Structure 1
Amino acid sequence: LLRGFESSLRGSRVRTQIDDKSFIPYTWQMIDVPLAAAKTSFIAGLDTRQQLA
């Protein structure tokens, strides 16, 4: 009780307790939905300046 008590000594206040772990699992939201992507020939068009007949 008087000597076996844990004190907030050096080594426990190191910055690596925060900087070594990334904040990605605490802020990111679960998606589980696939992302889209489409060809450039789908949004722009077919470029009607081709041949004639």
Structure 2
Amino acid sequence: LLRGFESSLRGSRVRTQIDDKSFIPYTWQMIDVPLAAAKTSFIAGLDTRQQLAY
């Protein structure tokens, strides 16, 4: 109790406890919906405008 106790000694206060770990499991949500990227011509248009014959 008097001399076998726990304390905080330098090296145990190293900044790497933050700089080795992400905030990602702490700031991210749980999103089950997939990403919806799709073909460009579907939105952009079909280029239907008499392009020059070569």
Q: What TM-score, normalized to structure 2?
A: 0.82
Q: Counterparts of 2:34 and 2:16 in 1: how far apart (Å)?
A: 35
Counterpart in the other structure of 1:4: 4
Please give the alpha-carbon distance, in whole angstroms, between the structure 2 residues aligned to 1:52 and 1:19.
Answer: 59
CA, structure 1 residues 52+11, in 2 after alignment: closer, same or farther (shift >3 Å)? closer
- Aligned residue pairs, count: 53
**RMSD of equivalent CA atoms:** 2.5
- Secondary structure, counterpart of 2:33 in structure 1: coil
Match of 2:43 in 1: 43
**Which blocks of at least 5 consecutive residues in structure 2 are unaligned?**
none
Q: CA, structure 1 residues 49+3, in 2 after alignment: closer, same or farther (shift >3 Å)?
A: same
Distance 2:8 2:52 in 1: 83
Query: 1:20 Cα shift?
Result: 0.5
Task: Provide the C-alpha distance between the structure 2 equivalents of 1:15 and 1:52, rounded to a whole number of angstroms.
Answer: 65
Using the TM superposition, give the Cα deviation of residue 35 of structure 1 relative to its aligned residue in structure 2, in angstroms. 0.8
